[PDB]
Design a protein around this ligand. Sequence first.
Ligand SMILES: NC(=O)c1nnc(N[C@H]2CCCNC2)c2cc(-c3ccc(Cl)cc3)sc12
Length: 259
Amino acid sequence: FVEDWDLVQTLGEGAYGEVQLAVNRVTEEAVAVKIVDMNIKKEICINKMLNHENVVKFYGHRREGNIQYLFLEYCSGGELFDRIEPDIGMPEPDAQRFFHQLMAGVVYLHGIGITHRDIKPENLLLDERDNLKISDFGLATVFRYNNRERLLNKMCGTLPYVAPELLKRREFHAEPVDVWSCGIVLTAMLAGELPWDQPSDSCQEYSDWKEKKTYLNPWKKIDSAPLALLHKILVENPSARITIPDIKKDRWYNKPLKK
Ligand SMILES: NC(=O)c1nnc(N[C@H]2CCCNC2)c2cc(-c3ccc(Cl)cc3)sc12
């Protein structure tokens, strides 16, 4: 009977189907079941490569007709999105802890040559101890294989989180794109709002940032220390944008905090 599971509740809904909570009949172990009506083959292949404490673990899959089932590590704390209070954000120490964990998971992915391509609070989950787990690898791809980097060209992601080079250039490096979205997530956590609809030449809020008008929201709400880190992350030229090894040396990143 140890291979029997009960579907007890609906957790979420992807663009493909729904996420349900399954509980083992014998052990009471819980696992999230992603249901996609019925891209998916690739998501499964990438998931099989993942093994890190800040990345949702993959247990297996099953296809029963035109419906694909993905078995994943259950994150009872839900989406990071739901911890962000509109127009407020969250306490700085919590944001810093989540950011440290997000960096750990991103360093891990990049180390194995995987880029997520859709980092945002809806795709960052929390376990029962509020540990952050990167989730939703449906847009992820390989950017390094046999120690050779491949440039990306596919436009994908979520506009408010995408880096400007994706919109403007035919090809671009993968890593700086994921660094940029992490910066947008940090901004959301500290201000409870996204800075712009998209980082385009025609977006006023993006121009304001390029013009250093930090006396405006959301910047005004952010302390000088984390704001200085955002100044290094949200840099238009991806070749000049801060890399993760340098983020790890940032003053705010290393500031001891607590509520
Ligand atoms: N792997 C999981 O665990 C898992 N995976 N995906 C979820 N939602 C997707 C939806 C599409 C965007 N990306 C997130 C999700 C929602 C959860 C939850 C947990 C507790 C509660 Cl009260 C509510 C929801 S747990 C969970």
